[PDB]
Symmetry: D3
Subunit: 62 residues, 6 copies
């Protein structure tokens, strides 16, 4: 299985590292996938590019 | 509902803000979603990364 | 530009048609795309497949 | 944050429920997001639609 | 590398099989990926769900 | 048809040009689409953002 994660830009390499590790373990537990068959990848979305209720994350002071 | 929007790179912050605002309004009008539940995010695609009938926008730009 | 829209399953043909029409109008207004260059497509997500804070819409439906 | 999960079709309701809760917990842990800010959705991909080394999952006898 | 393909619903298992084979070979040629590291997967989009210029594929008689 | 391509970041312009032309040709062959109906776009994924068996591509020394 594959997991595509979308995050607002600015998380650290460490947090990214924990996303990949924890979501890999989650996918292993939930569906029994061999660890080495699990791909997780992350899109960093700029704050001008992410909207919640019609207002950008940049406007919302995220 | 969620909308993921793909644009060739280079739109300004205000152009992207108008995408967030107007696509959120479109979704509220079309499906009656509460404004605050609507998420829009935008991917900026480099010119060298976007193909139209086998030729990248960068090559069609020249 | 392209828009990929995610909706919980069960919208009608006309609801989906209004998403196509209104998001295409939104994109033309926001980025000045020619109407004929705009592509919208919609994914219907099963209730059992859509999670909001760790609980599926199917479980929150009951 | 958002997580978009791709699985070969055929996972049961319970398996998806485990994907939703475990991935959501993973993301809370990894980036310090509140429960209500994590969205997880799953795409079930038909066996004839999923390719691994140029062969379908159906083809590989799954 | 990964390739996600979007097709209007109705292509045959054979055409799907050729998509997976040919796009796998394309990704091998273009980027030198070991054949067995190449995943290709296909989304069949219903004709009520795909829009071109604000009009559904179903309306367009596709 | 549309093809969305995910690559670890770092492919040169020429490699992407080969991804665009070869994938487009692949799709023309496989489903009998005219050249001008095939859209191909590429996402460059940072090495720290791409996970394989719970480890980043950076981590795996790429």
């Amino acid at each position: 299985p594959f997991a595509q994660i979308y995050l607002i830009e600015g998380r650290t390499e460490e947090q990214k590292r924990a996303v990949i590790e924890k979501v890999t373990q989650a996918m292993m537990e939930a569906v029994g996938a061999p660890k080495e068959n699990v791909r997780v990848w992350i899109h960093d979305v700029p704050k001008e590019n992410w909207g919640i209720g019609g207002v950008s994350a940049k406007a919302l002071g995220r």
